[PDB]
Amino acid sequence: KEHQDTWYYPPDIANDLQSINLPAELKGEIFACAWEYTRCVIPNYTNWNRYVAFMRIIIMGIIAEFRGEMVDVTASNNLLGYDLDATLAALFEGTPGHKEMAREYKTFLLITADKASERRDGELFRRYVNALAQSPRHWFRMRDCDALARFTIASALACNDLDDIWFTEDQFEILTEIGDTLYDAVAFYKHRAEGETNSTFAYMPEDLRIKAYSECREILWALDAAWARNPKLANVINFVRFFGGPIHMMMRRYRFVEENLTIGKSETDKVKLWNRVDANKRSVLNTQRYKALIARSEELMFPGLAEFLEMGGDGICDKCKYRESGVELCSECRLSWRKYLECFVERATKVFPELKTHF
Amino acid sequence: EHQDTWYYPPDIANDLQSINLPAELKGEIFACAWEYTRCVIPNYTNWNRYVAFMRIIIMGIIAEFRGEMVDVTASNNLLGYDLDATLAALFEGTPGHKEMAREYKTFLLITADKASERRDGELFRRYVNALAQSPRHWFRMRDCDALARFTIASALACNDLDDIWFTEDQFEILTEIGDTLYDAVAFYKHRAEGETNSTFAYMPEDLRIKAYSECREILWALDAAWARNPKLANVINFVRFFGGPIHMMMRRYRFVEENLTIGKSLNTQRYKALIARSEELMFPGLAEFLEMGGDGICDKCKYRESYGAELSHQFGGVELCSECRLSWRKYLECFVERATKVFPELKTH
Ligand SMILES: [Zn+2]
Ligand SMILES: [Zn+2]
């Protein structure tokens, strides 16, 4: 009686992973997911070879997240039978950010694969998690990377052949903050259940979730109005809008249907010993891995991440509870995070002046 | 708590000069036109068509707000807009200009009457009854009520895709997907509002979740099958973003107020006169639908005198019988079969 999903995807990717022995049902669902994500958050395309590149970037990141052993962006440049530099070139060759985005993506595969493997207990991840909680601006920069937000703004530009359009770093940070805030606001109860740490409103105060969503949505509406008559920038708004919650309704990866076409929770609704032993013998906290990766910070890490890990890896703050061998913010850090959120509107109006010259 | 500030292009900023409504209302209305248009037509190439579409929606919004203010019969000049002129700006040079004019005038016609004293009259009683004659008929009329093929039409227009069109049967399936997606998500809200135009007032509540899943699957199949044709992506995008997501995205809806949750809250003279204007006002077939269906074909089916007295926390149209409920059930159950006949590129994977 109850609908079983059949997986649809274009034949371009249907014979990918010919070298990987995953059940054929699971390949289909990975391919379906990659197609569904692409179409939801990049709904317009002109360049099909770029669209397909992006699909392959998502395929790898799904597999990276499900069996981290398989996807070691440090070890080789051939991942799951794909040429990673070549696939990224297929997407970004001619675009202003190619170099910085290839670094963005490799950081994503590093942290994702390490988070979904024995290397979760390793110095590198430990230092990533502590550096998350360093400041709210740091949190969002790193949240951006975990979600491939600025990476997907670029790929959206790219896939519509908009090879000349780009953004200040301040702008990228506001755009991704809007998307990540929208997404984490909608996904709050799902993140709490499954015990997800990379969630804005696990750090930011819960009492401001509804206002933050309201303001981020209003500002993106404002920003879209300001950019009216420039269909090219409509693709940057589209990424942020569809990413920011709607994909929960549209992609089979999410549970809209299994949860009776509801999102969220009303006010009146209900609320590895041996793996840790045998990992310590294999010296899981590999500092030589960490230092080796800090050495390759021009290849594997986004601009400033190496300096972020070195300064914040052990936690800057004295009263904050950090990860030792996520972060529980102290009350003075909770208040500064709160202050950073509460003045979101000013912060975005500074970086995007066009918001104040409406008519 | 959050007090909305309204954003919209300047182009329509000084629309409705002629009309005397408070500037905030006009701000909310322009906002909704802009937001609906960006949500369900998220790409454009031709700005002057985009803006016509926004004007098409502005008028539609007010028709629903105050029907008395938009009477598409009375005159072709509504709220200082020339309807035929806006429609021409949007659809001139495109396959369905003439058909989409009718589509829209029906929408204004029916929405005005729904939201006015004319809800007690003979046209609307015949409309409500006609809705429930047949499931095919239901989806065709619901299509018009939601401007589904109108907006598929508009989305091609706004992207200068003047050569692209679909058969009646493809429009019927395209809009059935979109309207089944939307009416499955909005079930409880439609029921609270005593709506007549809700798919699951008529189709069975225990197929609501499955029908959504099935429509979302086939739309993914159609999308995949349309791989490498980014013109047709504009069509998929309309059905996808219309079929639920607008509830999250538009300030028209109550996602923020509901704490970022979804689904967790006897005179004949006018009727006759408009049926004689069927070429201008009614979509191809609606006259026959209204004439054959207006009084009800079925006899175990429970109708009403007028649909005028305002209802709440219950659907406010024909209550189908044991036998009609089963033929409707069956029309739903073969949805996948019907969609595969109409778009054979589905089974040819
Ligand atoms: Zn602290
Ligand atoms: Zn009956």
From Swiss-Prot, chain B:
Pathway(s) where this gene product acts: Hormone biosynthesis
EC number(s) recorded for this UniProt protein: 4.2.3.-
Disulfide bonds: none
A biological process from GO: abscisic acid biosynthetic process
Example of a GO MF term: lyase activity
Domain of life (superkingdom): Eukaryota
Family according to the record: Belongs to the alpha-ionylideneethane synthase family.
Protein name per the record: Alpha-ionylideneethane synthase aba3
Source organism of this protein record: Botryotinia fuckeliana (strain B05.10) (Noble rot fungus)
Classification of source organism: Eukaryota, Fungi, Dikarya, Ascomycota, Pezizomycotina
Gene name in the database record: aba3
